[PDB]
Design a protein around this ligand. Structure first.
Ligand SMILES: CC(C)(COP(=O)(O)OP(=O)(O)OC[C@H]1O[C@@H](n2cnc3c(N)ncnc32)[C@H](O)[C@@H]1OP(=O)(O)O)[C@@H](O)C(=O)NCCC(=O)NCCS
Ligand SMILES: CC(C)(COP(=O)(O)OP(=O)(O)OC[C@H]1O[C@@H](n2cnc3c(N)ncnc32)[C@H](O)[C@@H]1OP(=O)(O)O)[C@@H](O)C(=O)NCCC(=O)NCCS
Ligand SMILES: CC(C)(COP(=O)(O)OP(=O)(O)OC[C@H]1O[C@@H](n2cnc3c(N)ncnc32)[C@H](O)[C@@H]1OP(=O)(O)O)[C@@H](O)C(=O)NCCC(=O)NCCS
Ligand SMILES: CC(C)(COP(=O)(O)OP(=O)(O)OC[C@H]1O[C@@H](n2cnc3c(N)ncnc32)[C@H](O)[C@@H]1OP(=O)(O)O)[C@@H](O)C(=O)NCCC(=O)NCCS
Ligand SMILES: Cc1ccc(C(=O)C[n+]2ccn3cccc3c2-c2ccc(F)cc2)cc1
Ligand SMILES: Cc1ccc(C(=O)C[n+]2ccn3cccc3c2-c2ccc(F)cc2)cc1
Ligand SMILES: Cc1ccc(C(=O)C[n+]2ccn3cccc3c2-c2ccc(F)cc2)cc1
Ligand SMILES: Cc1ccc(C(=O)C[n+]2ccn3cccc3c2-c2ccc(F)cc2)cc1
Ligand SMILES: [Cl-]
Ligand SMILES: [Cl-]
Ligand SMILES: [Cl-]
Ligand SMILES: [Cl-]
Lengths: 396, 396, 396, 396
């Protein structure tokens, strides 16, 4: 049982492992496309000797954090241990090697999407975005008098074929991702992949359509088994007008009973309607998970809320150093110190705070971060909060 | 069709209407208990002439708002229009008369629980607390190393019969309600009612048990049809230790597969476990709705976040006046003015902001509050936020 | 945390624990009836100091084993640990004390019904009877030409009220239990309890009826929610004629679509019909679990199959001694020895073999009993098998 | 309405009938492969005159029976009567002609799989193997300390593509089928067919994977609609080590909640786990049905249990002769006699006894075999039992 970077000859074994480990497996053609995001030395495999019985890798991503700052980010993915080699320390060994390479390469953060919520905390990852499914019974849906885009004229939204307006989607998404915490750059190959999924498949998913506004788009399709359900796979809007107009069009799908979307907890949709309850929350789950690789680089790179007044504290991360943390004027300074700690937390907890999705007060109530000063808790809550609500870009 | 305060002779007709209008109807014995909370002139009825075809009333309540301030509150309830007299203006007439009496009596706010989410906005009520159902599959539940109350000794929690520890529940609840926004005083008659429901009913609900800690309690029962589901009807905890200890005991119910509770969005339970996902959000809905009766009294009575620096603005409520609003040092001053408005919103929107459950930014994104200054939005968001998370006390 | 025999004052605390631990809890009236089967010193409780946080007990039973031999048997029941005191060693301590008392009192075996199948193996109990649910769609059911009781005359079976024929049921059951491995003596109090359950309950179970034959009876009722399903709670027959006649009557319930029964794997019912498939096995589970307390007394008391020729071996029970085992003429001799073992197994495995429900070959294939001689396996299989098929009497 | 052997021109009509009669119909390409197992004169068709309105055939198979003896066996299949020609005596005529040809060709037994359980008894077929579906919730599955293949080193099992290891599967299966009662030789064309089904189908079944051990294999795939269910289509193991190791690998499929398999009643899997209940029996049904064509050849060819001592009896088969049956030293002699019968049974009953899956005692209790000597029943039970448990090879 050796651990090393795969050669070209290892990839068929890796795809075999992948097909057996991941039900949503993408097939070799698209796997080869995603592979273009894996840097040299971004992958590890474990061979039995010999066949491949373990693999893991990371992709080079760009993540937006509060203050519209974009960070290089290592996106862990394609992680798998053969069913024949469980409980043998392979995951711990693969993760440790990848984390070493990630740290040494200069990434301040790593990130992933969790197949199960209980595997990742122990490797320093905390859930940092929250996914909310809303299902709207559109038969009862009426817009509020206050809602935009219901004056007296033409509509700004068009129903179009996705593949014919790639450039407009790209441009809209690029603007979105640069101003929203959780935003990710979507490279060319992933647009290739996205638009390929837009076509109908024999005995599979149905054709996808798009609603296009100058400042937003929605991609959707009818559910394959429930023909009265439309699933919005992606809705991206830069203005409130674009967001309302797109939802006016979606609610105008008179063949459907229900419209569903995976969105975020601060989606304004429910307040667009006269009956807020019509937008039922049918599902709630963690989205992006974050491991802060370098505490001072990550804390200093992020912008903070201007409303809170300047304050200073000392933060210990359990096996990640102790720092003097000074926050004021929306910026932070984070320097080494051996002074007594005022706040302690494990490294994963810091990831959960980092994009503003969880409150320090709430984590304190679970004793996941310790302090003997509630004024400091209030200050951290306020400082780490995000003006623009945190969202989840796309799964990887 | 006349409108007036009911006499003693009207109550049987009112109970008839109630039995036909409300499936969860409580029967005459308990209705007579709840009636002790209705002040003189707190009820209206509409007679056909003659029988009672419409009714509405309010109860005298005490509501805790941020800053641990307790306000007299008119709790609307028992509202019903006969199926034979729909679409005849009865509700609008009954609500207008009750609101007049409520305003003239000196209540700064009114409140209610909504049978449907689309009836109430037009009468000035906005949803102000959010209910979250969590369902935990307790077979996989493991507590985090960091979680309190897992040292090495005895347990502080006891399993007891509710009716034998009334005084300890009362005292714990009283402490809870005074420090939590959304807290309501629970008078003696409602404790009588609560403990009566704790007994098993033939072909109805099962016996209720309690878990009692010096600083908290949980009341629960096995679901009547799903015998592997325990439903926590009420969990009230004053310290984080009490909250964790109670959940350790609940997860020790080894006969059950699932534990469910109606709680709030900031419940720390998910962070107590090693796998946060095990606490599934199975339901989400509006709780308490608020109508601000007197804007300056309500805005001045509430405490505000100290973290935000002093600022001044002008707020127009659509048919509720225009005010110079100055907020600093956690307090607000709110005085009449005819200066140009910087923020406009309908009255229900203000209720939704009032206990800190919804962000002004989010309501702005739906154009439910208008302003041309995003710095002001950030300031309102921060000022109106609640240090202690907002919760829902009990249904009325 | 002390461990001792309960006093009269402890029983209310015990019933409180029971009501919270067991959903099928029987109420204090019937609990007091079952208590008459608990000998002096047959119960233990664990107090916190003080309230009762753990309990366990055994009942004095009489179990029939192959060869129609009746053994004194300690039937463990009413075992519970408070949810507040889990993972504290209470069960292990209560079980050890009860087992000591059981052994010292002279019981050769103990027995129980398992709330969960994974708790009991480690205390020396193995599953020894198998429960099979059959559901017959009686609309298609036709009896084979060969089946008894379809000649040309009157019927021998009568439809009767259970409470009016107690004596005939008692006598039939007594004959049954003495000739069937797994049979248990049913004392007077348990007949009192059984016939009380036969009456309808408001918002509960429906009235029970009986089909009575001189050599058998069936007790049944319509399912409370599925009104096309009749549930046979108990069918006891001494002759094949009685068994067939009772099933002819059950299939004549023309209001029902389905008849279901919890029976055993060798129930001949499927072979009574022209279409064997109509008797669907809808459920399968372990019934009685056995812990052999005294290996030589238990092995010597049981009868063995005459068909296998005399043989001798050496059996080690993992922490239960090593014995020279000689079997011939349907009897066994089992004496101490230090000669090398030919067969090893844990104590629970021996319980699983003891009533003939599991084959030694099958347990060997799972390596739950070790030997390096397959001829010996064949010999054990044959010797331990039961002429009369093993059945499960009643739950306790 | 004539009955005769089909010509080449009849086969399209036969495939038309097949497509309309069998939902699981295999298509013409694979039907032509299975056709290579049909001997000359192994098929009959009924023409209306003219189109084909009835068909039936048999295939040349090799069946293993207790004592590891392999018998030529006529496997009935592809039997169908047009919906337009029901209740016209076609089946009875086709079966009688095929049975004549089968008998005259020298087959001692015929066999089939039943589309419905009530059609076949009257033509002399009795169910002779039992299929058991086990569904394991693998999230709770833990192996017993006693279970093999959990030492401290590498794994002997590999995850592989089925099509790349055909030869190893063939060799393992060949060993299996020769030592297990119910085993069938699988010719080349059926391996061609099996491996073709291993590939994914568009809007059909998913890709199949294999777990390969030197002495066993498992073939499995994720269920097409329930993506948390893995279905083991075939598991074949020659040693207990191979069987345990394969199940260790299957339970290591961490993406799945449940693993299911169609197996036999003596599968040791449940005893491999600490909680035997985790292996739920979700389905139970008859497998292979047998018609004994020649009673003395079949009874003399089979091996019998050595443990029972020599005995002699007289057996009448209802329309199949009367024989002096002498059994001793694991062999039987079966000769003609006119002496009085001690045991009578229909021919189908004998098929049900023949592979040891049903006990003579059980069939006697249903009066499906008559005798006035219970000692003889015990002797038959013991003699006809199979050392190696009876299994079902593959459907045909
Ligand atoms: C990798 C895998 C299938 C199991 O791997 P493994 O080689 O058996 O794990 P290792 O022995 O290397 O060590 C993993 C540690 O986490 C624990 N662990 C691993 N998988 C687990 C699971 N599914 N549930 C709970 N705990 C788990 C182990 O107990 C071990 O810690 P411990 O020895 O201190 O108890 C499993 O963890 C899995 O489901 N995938 C993990 C996914 C992941 O981490 N990242 C990918 C998301 S893109
Ligand atoms: C009261 C009731 C059953 C219907 O009453 P009604 O006498 O028909 O209503 P009125 O004619 O007095 O006027 C009510 C106004 O709200 C609207 N409205 C009333 N009930 C409605 C409902 N269930 N859904 C949508 N709109 C409704 C009416 O259209 C009317 O406004 P409009 O005439 O401008 O359109 C109904 O509103 C109901 O479900 N209960 C209301 C509950 C409530 O408001 N408070 C109690 C919670 S404790
Ligand atoms: C008794 C009870 C609720 C838990 O008791 P407890 O006091 O936490 O158990 P203890 O700490 O005394 O020790 C029990 C041992 O079995 C294990 N165990 C106990 N309950 C278990 C369960 N529900 N599942 C799996 N393992 C369990 C423990 O891990 C411990 O062994 P370990 O420390 O070596 O791992 C639980 O076992 C239960 O469900 N009832 C047991 C029923 C029984 O044994 N007999 C009654 C049938 S009538
Ligand atoms: C063949 C078929 C569809 C009906 O055939 P048919 O020509 O109507 O039957 P016949 O008239 O030739 O005679 C069949 C006898 O069995 C009975 N029978 C036939 N199909 C039956 C069914 N589905 N259910 C119950 N009884 C049936 C008939 O009543 C008749 O006996 P009877 O006249 O003494 O009552 C039907 O039996 C069927 O489902 N397939 C039979 C499958 C089979 O036997 N072997 C193939 C398994 S690979
Ligand atoms: C080399 C390579 C790298 C990644 C991939 C991908 O296909 C990643 N990817 C993308 C989008 N997705 C949506 C749902 C699931 C995914 C997967 C994925 C796959 C495996 C994981 F562990 C986590 C995520 C394929 C090949
Ligand atoms: C005079 C009088 C006043 C109120 C009542 C009550 O029973 C109020 N109450 C209390 C608790 N609840 C829980 C669920 C539903 C309730 C009801 C209730 C009843 C009617 C409503 F329109 C709204 C709420 C009964 C009588
Ligand atoms: C003192 C006393 C002793 C036993 C009991 C009984 O009621 C036992 N009993 C009987 C029949 N049953 C059918 C289903 C469940 C039962 C229970 C039972 C109760 C608890 C157990 F742990 C196991 C079984 C009640 C009181
Ligand atoms: C000439 C010819 C002979 C047989 C066949 C086959 O396809 C047999 N066969 C094989 C496997 N199977 C699994 C499920 C159902 C089957 C069928 C089958 C088909 C018809 C039956 F009456 C019984 C079985 C096809 C053509
Ligand atoms: Cl970005
Ligand atoms: Cl209050
Ligand atoms: Cl007995
Ligand atoms: Cl064979």
């Amino acid at each position: 049982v050796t651990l090393c970077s795969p050669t070209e000859d290892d990839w068929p074994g890796m795809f075999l492992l992948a097909a057996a480990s991941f039900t949503d497996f993408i097939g070799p053609e698209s796997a080869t496309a995603w592979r273009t995001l894996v840097p040299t030395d971004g992958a590890v495999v474990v061979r039995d000797g010999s066949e491949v019985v373990g693999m893991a890798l990371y992709m080079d991503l760009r993540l937006t954090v509060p203050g519209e700052v974009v960070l290089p980010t290592a996106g862990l993915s394609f992680v798998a241990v053969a069913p024949t080699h469980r409980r043998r320390g392979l995951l711990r060994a693969m993760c440790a090697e990848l984390h070493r390479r990630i740290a040494d390469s200069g990434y301040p953060v790593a990130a992933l999407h969790a197949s199960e919520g209980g595997i990742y905390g122990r490797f320093g990852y905390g859930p940092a975005t929250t996914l909310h499914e809303l299902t709207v019974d559109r038969r009862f849906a009426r817009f509020h008098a206050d809602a935009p885009g219901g004056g007296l004229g033409g509509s700004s939204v068009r129903l179009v074929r996705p593949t014919e307006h790639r450039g407009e989607f790209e441009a809209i998404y690029e603007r979105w991702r640069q101003q929203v915490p959780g935003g990710l750059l979507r490279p060319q190959v992933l647009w290739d992949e996205l638009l390929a999924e837009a076509k109908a498949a024999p005995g599979g998913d149905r054709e996808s359509f798009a609603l296009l506004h100058p400042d937003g788009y929605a991609l959707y399709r009818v559910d394959r088994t429930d023909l009265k359900l439309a699933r919005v796979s992606e809705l991206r809007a830069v203005t409130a007008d674009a967001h309302c107009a797109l939802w006016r069009a979606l609610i105008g799908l008179d063949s459907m009973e229900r419209i569903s979307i995976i969105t975020h907890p601060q989606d304004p949709l429910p307040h667009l309607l006269t009956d807020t309850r019509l937008a039922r929350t049918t599902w709630r789950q963690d989205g992006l998970w974050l491991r802060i690789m370098n505490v001072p680089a990550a804390l200093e790179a992020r912008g903070y809320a201007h409303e809170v007044g300047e304050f200073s504290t000392v933060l210990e991360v359990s096996d990640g150093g102790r720092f003097a943390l000074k926050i004021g004027d929306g910026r932070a300074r984070c320097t080494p110190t051996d002074a007594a700690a005022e706040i302690e937390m494990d490294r994963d907890v810091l990831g959960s705070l980092y994009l503003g999705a969880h409150r320090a007060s709430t984590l304190a109530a679970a004793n996941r971060l310790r302090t003997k000063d509630s004024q400091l808790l209030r200050r951290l809550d306020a400082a780490f909060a995000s003006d623009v609500p945190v969202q989840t870009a796309f799964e990887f």
